[PDB]
Amino acid sequence: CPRFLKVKNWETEVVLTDTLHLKSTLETGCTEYICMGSIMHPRPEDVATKDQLFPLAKEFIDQYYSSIKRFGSKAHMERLEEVNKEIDTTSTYQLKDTELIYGAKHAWRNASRCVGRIQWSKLQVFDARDCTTAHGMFNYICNHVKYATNKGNLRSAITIFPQRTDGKHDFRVWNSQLIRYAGYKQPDGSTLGDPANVQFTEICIQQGWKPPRGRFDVLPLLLQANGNDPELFQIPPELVLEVPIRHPKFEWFKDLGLKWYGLPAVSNMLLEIGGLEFSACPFSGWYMGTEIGVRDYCDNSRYNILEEVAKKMNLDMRKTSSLWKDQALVEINIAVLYSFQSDKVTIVDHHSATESFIKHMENEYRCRGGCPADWVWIVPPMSGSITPVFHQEMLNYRLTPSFEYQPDPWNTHVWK
Amino acid sequence: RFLKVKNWETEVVLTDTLHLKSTLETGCTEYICMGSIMHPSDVATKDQLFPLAKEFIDQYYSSIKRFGSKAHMERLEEVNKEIDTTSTYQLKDTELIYGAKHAWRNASRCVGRIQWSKLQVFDARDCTTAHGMFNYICNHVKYATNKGNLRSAITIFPQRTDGKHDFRVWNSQLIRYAGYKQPDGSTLGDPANVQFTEICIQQGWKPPRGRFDVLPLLLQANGNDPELFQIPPELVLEVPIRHPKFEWFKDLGLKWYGLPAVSNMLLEIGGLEFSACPFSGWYMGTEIGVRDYCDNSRYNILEEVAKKMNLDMRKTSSLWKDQALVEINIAVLYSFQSDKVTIVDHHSATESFIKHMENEYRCRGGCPADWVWIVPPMSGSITPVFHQEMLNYRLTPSFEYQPDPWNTHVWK
Ligand code: HEM
Ligand code: HEM
Ligand SMILES: Cc1cc(N)nc2cc(-c3ccc(OCc4cncs4)c(CN)c3)ccc12
Ligand SMILES: Cc1cc(N)nc2cc(-c3ccc(OCc4cncs4)c(CN)c3)ccc12
Ligand SMILES: C[C@H](O)[C@H](O)[C@H]1CNc2nc(N)[nH]c(=O)c2N1
Ligand SMILES: C[C@H](O)[C@H](O)[C@H]1CNc2nc(N)[nH]c(=O)c2N1
Ligand SMILES: [Zn+2]
């Protein structure tokens, strides 16, 4: 691989030089002759063997001691020997609290698809590796929600449950996010609630959940501890902060009865540190408005209120070239930002977030020698080119620690 | 291996076998993806040239269902003797048309390729001077414009020989507006062309110093210095931009040209290089109304439109930029349609491209596609290409980038 790599910003002419790509540790899916940059994702027995784990742990341990300016030190060599001894006798090892916190912050810092990473070092890390039961998982998750929510002054956070051991004792959160709304397919084919969530809603109902059958029913938590069958828990509703969506000019917008929750909390990904696998690690920050306003509302396989908004706007919906879709999309995203700001719930518009990300990316190139970024995901789903990431070249590559995808647990669980 | 691409909105899955036929590089590796680098990373030889020519002839006679026929075996031998004796070879007209249509078909970044086989190919390989180039280009412009009912076209000038005798169109597009760098700092006209505009002044052009001054053609023939030509104004179709609800929009004084004709790329067929090959189609509304008027380094009227819309411009969270962008694009589509000048909105175009992808996977086993470039620069996720997984790879014949001529040309 070539040793220096330049990315150019075509709007400002700034050229940056990436050396950090030489530390990349896993595959992007691309080859010399094909590019998978727009592919979304390019056995329970399988855990890391003694031999695979040694290099992965030393790799991480070295990187940690280099970060605290103690590389090659006595404390570094001793920690190497102690980690190596644990792997030798017990086939795994345990991270220190210092290294767990470092590893979580760096999995976010390394997350190429996240436009929010200017915040990467202000992340509250909750060590939940002492959890043994799904009730205990419920306790840790409630405390996460309340802290992160902070009455609307949101704060970013991750709760890290025990690492994988033999693959038959995993901790998993079956929900894809801690807070989502239920979706119900009707016998007539239509959908009530959130169509993205129909499958998980059906699983919950099989597991015993009594559905209210409404538009905005917060889904229960489905929680698996130590490889056991998962269990249901209702989140205390006073912990679920919500914003009713209204519009600063259209008095009729409130009459649509829309609301959204304040806290985006992803709970189905896997955190990899030093070759250790934390299959339950929910993490939360705060919304970019377009994640609600464009995707959560206007996607056809979502709440698809685009037509309903355009109807109340008196827009010619007979031809696409009227841009009636584009005009409704902007107003909805205007409402979403205005409702969150009015109720003083933290939220960032896509102009401010993309402008922070450029500033962040440059500092990373300066202080770190690079910043992996996934342009396909960094650029917002509306008004792309009137944000500065559009004209920003980016290099994508996977560093560790990292957040990884993992199969949905109902596909893999061995039912007791 | 076969490769699948899924559409996350329809859950339709397509299977790509076509990628196995490429051998040009993309710039990515297994460890670093360069999908958002604009130009990731010229004289042939007889040694490199025969296999490149061999593959192209093979796929031409395979396309016309006569692989391994007598005409195929004799075109093989005919091309062999000619690279032998002349260090290059000349394409039949049939092969020139096939390769030109297939370079468009292979343009991963082009959302308009459902039209790919409807392309009028103008053979200009007998041209020898810049006066001849200007005659061929006026004819192109006039055929393609067709009084508003635009038609796709390409004009192919002689191929590169030894690098010292390139034909080049120095303009990046056949029709563009001048950009004048003011003393008081700002920019009159079009900021995208400020450099080229000054190069035209440096060659003798008399600038009208207006806001919509059509630049002259600057034309290089057989390695010689370029020469200035004014396109006859009646050949240049333009649309005054107005808005169907905001009667104050016409007062902005805006207009654009109807014909997009890219003239600075390189067409490669069968190992041969065509350094001058202007090609044109019609506009997607966003090329004008998003990029040409609203980029920072462009006409940047966004602020003035939000002004006359009396919008709150103090904080970005009011999305005043988003509201203005949509209205600018409503006007553009509304003006071209009212003048019966061919234009496509980004909803219809992306929708046609999904249909084009379907056709390609069925009959051809795939369709190279650059999601970074296919997705429009506004309202991305409310178009069907946002949720469509694409595989990008390099098939030949193709359109390529080349250096600007004012960097390489040995002046005299
Ligand atoms: C602090 C405020 C944050 C903002 C504004 C933010 C914003 C975003 C957005 C807009 C996306 C794309 C979402 C989509 O298109 O559906 C994203 C992806 C992502 N974010 Fe952030 N995020 C924040 C916090 C965090 C935190 C705290 C973490 C982890 C510690 C994180 C890790 C990720 C990851 C891993 C992805 C990629 C998900 C995937 O690959 O599917 N983010 N973020
Ligand atoms: C017929 C109507 C056509 C439409 C609506 C159309 C639309 C587009 C658009 C929107 C782009 C992206 C431009 C940008 O946003 O920067 C593009 C790129 C491109 N088009 Fe098409 N196009 C058309 C015809 C053609 C024709 C006739 C050719 C050549 C024969 C062609 C070759 C290309 C190439 C090579 C690119 C990519 C250039 C690059 O790599 O930078 N297109 N087209
Ligand atoms: C912390 C934080 C703050 C925020 N503001 N936004 C986020 C969005 C994400 C995200 C976005 C899309 C995803 O992928 C969606 C898919 C559905 N089906 C196949 S991929 C996933 C993967 N769970 C996560 C993850 C974390 C976020
Ligand atoms: C035929 C046709 C019809 C149409 N409707 N639209 C087009 C847009 C294009 C295009 C768009 C951006 C480019 O940009 C690359 C660069 C600009 N500056 C430094 S690299 C280029 C390459 N000249 C071509 C090319 C052809 C088009
Ligand atoms: C850096 C980035 O690749 C570059 O600005 C590209 C991004 N995508 C684009 N997409 C379109 N349609 N047109 C463009 O000019 C660009 N520019
Ligand atoms: C097929 C395509 O890659 C897919 O729809 C992606 C495109 N880019 C995206 N970008 C973001 N930020 N979020 C997304 O969900 C997606 N979806
Ligand atoms: Zn790639």
Question: B57 is written with which tokens?
Answer: 């002839």
Of A222, A142, A277, A273, residue with least CA distance to A413: A222
Positive or negative, the Cα torsion across B150, B152, B158, B164? Answer: positive
What was the resolution (in A) of this experimentally determined structure?
A: 2.3
Task: Mark yes or no for CB contact A327/B326 under 8 Å.
Answer: yes
Collect all residues of chain A within an 8 Å Cβ-Cβ radius of residue B36: 37, 375-376, 393-394, 396
Across the strands, what pairs with B3?
A: B16
Task: Based on the residue annotation, tell me whether B211 is a catalytic residue of this protein.
Answer: no
Which amino acids of B are annotated as binding site for heme b, given as ranges?
Answer: 110, 401
Catalytic residue of the set A209, A260, A286, A324: A286
d(CA B39, CA B264): 14
Long-range CB contacts (within 8 A, 24+) of B323-327: B323/A330, B323/A334, B325/A383, B325/A386, B325/B289, B325/B290, B325/B294, B325/B378, B326/A323, B326/A326, B326/A327, B326/A330, B326/B378, B327/B243, B327/B246
CB contacts < 8 A, A to B, total 210
d(CA B231, CA A94): 75
Of B348, B346, B308, residue with least CA distance to B324: B308
Which amino acids of B are annotated as binding site, given as ranges?
Answer: 36, 110, 173, 282-283, 287, 372-373, 386, 401
Pocket of ligand 1, beta carbon within 6 A: A 108, 111, 113-116, 119, 123, 156, 158, 283, 285-286, 288, 291, 348, 353, 377, 403
| Radius of gyration of the CA atoms of chain A, in A | 23
Question: A151 is written with which tokens?
Answer: 């009455």
d(CA A271, CA B364): 41
Q: Is A80 exposed, middle or buried (0-12, 13-18, 19+ CB in 10 A)?
A: middle
Q: Is A301 touching B (CB cutoff 8 A)?
A: yes
When CB atoms are compared, the residue of A38, A376, A385 closest to B290 is A385
Pocket of ligand 6, beta carbon within 6 A: A 38, 40, 376-377; B 8, 386-389
When CB atoms are compared, the residue of A298, A327, A397 closest to B33 is A397
Catalytic residue of the set B105, B113, B176, B242: B113
d(CA B312, CA B295): 20
Kind and range of the H or E run holding B52: helix B46-63
Following DSSP, what letter does each residue of B150-166 receive, concatenated? ---EEEEPPPPSSSTT-
Q: Is B363 touching A (CB cutoff 8 A)?
A: no
Q: Is A4 touching B (CB cutoff 8 A)?
A: no
Following DSSP, what letter does each residue of B254-318 receive, concatenated? -EEES--EE-S-EEEETTEEES---EE--EEHHIIIIIIHHSTTS--THHHHHHHTT---SSGGG
For B137-153, b where at least 16 C-beta lie within 10 A, e where not — what string? bbebbbebbeeeebbbb
What is the A292 CA–ligand 1 centroid distance (Å)?
A: 13
Fill in the DSSP letter of residue B251: G
When CB atoms are compared, the residue of B290, B317, B329 closest to A349 is B317
d(CA B304, CA B355): 38
Residues 375-394 of B with CB under 8 A from A: 375-382, 386, 389-394
Q: Is B248 touching A (CB cutoff 8 A)?
A: no
d(CA B156, CA A388): 37
Task: Mark yes or no for CB contact B322/A386 under 8 Å.
Answer: yes
Q: Is A330 touching B (CB cutoff 8 A)?
A: yes
Contact A347, A341 (CB under 8 A): yes
Question: A325 is written with which tokens?
Answer: 């879709």
> % helix / strand / coil in chain B, to the nearest 5?
40, 15, 45
What is the A391 CA–ligand 5 centroid distance (Å)?
A: 6
d(CA A151, CA A343): 10
d(CA B340, CA A202): 52
B273 CB-near residues (< 8 Å, 6+ apart): B42, B44, B159, B160, B266, B267
Catalytic residue of the set B75, B95, B110, B116: B110
Question: B240 is written with which tokens?
Answer: 């005054």
Across the strands, what pairs with A218?
A: A181
Does the C-beta of B278 come closer than 6 Å to ligand 4? no
One-letter amino acid at B397 equals: P
Q: What chain B residue is nearest to A30 in terms of C-alpha separation?
A: B30
What is the A411 CA–ligand 6 centroid distance (Å)?
A: 24
Collect all residues of chain B within an 8 Å Cβ-Cβ radius of residue A294: 381-382
Question: A387 is written with which tokens?
Answer: 């944000």
Of B48, B237, B31, residue with least CA distance to B150: B237
Does the C-beta of B286 come closer than 6 Å to ligand 4? no
The answer to the question of whether A390 is labelled as a binding residue is yes
Assign B366 to helix, strand or coil: coil
> % helix / strand / coil in chain A, to the nearest 5?
40, 15, 45
d(CA A393, CA A374): 10
Helix axes B70-86, B46-63, angle to 10 degrees: 160
d(CA B393, CA A247): 45
d(CA B383, CA B190): 29
CA-to-CA separations, B387 to A52, A295, B11, B356, in angstroms, rounded: 37, 11, 10, 16
Fill in the DSSP letter of residue B409: -
Task: Based on the residue annotation, tell me whether B256 is a catalytic residue of this protein.
Answer: no
Catalytic residue of the set A109, A117, A164, A302: A117
Question: B268 is written with which tokens?
Answer: 């490669």
Does the C-beta of B279 come closer than 6 Å to ligand 5? no
Closest-CA distance of chain B to residue A188, Å: 19
CA atoms within 13 A of residue A381's CA, in its CB half-sphere: 21
> Domains of chain B by range and CATH?
16-125+152-162+266-280+350-374 (3.90.340.10), 126-151+166-237+401-405 (3.90.440.10), 238-260+283-348 (3.90.1230.10)
CA A12 from centre of chain: 30
CA-to-CA separations, B295 to A8, A383, B74, B298, in angstroms, rounded: 16, 11, 53, 5
Q: Is A138 touching B (CB cutoff 8 A)?
A: no
Task: Mark yes or no for CB contact A34/B26 under 8 Å.
Answer: yes
* Other beta carbons within 10 Å of B6: 16
Positive or negative, the Cα torsion across A273, A275, A276, A282? Answer: positive
What is the B264 CA–ligand 4 centroid distance (Å)?
A: 9
What is the phi/psi pair of residue A177, to 5°? -130, 155
Following DSSP, what letter does each residue of A374-397 receive, concatenated? -HHHHS-SSSGGGSTTTTB---B-
Method for structure elucidation: X-ray
Task: Based on the residue annotation, tell me whether A362 is a catalytic residue of this protein.
Answer: no
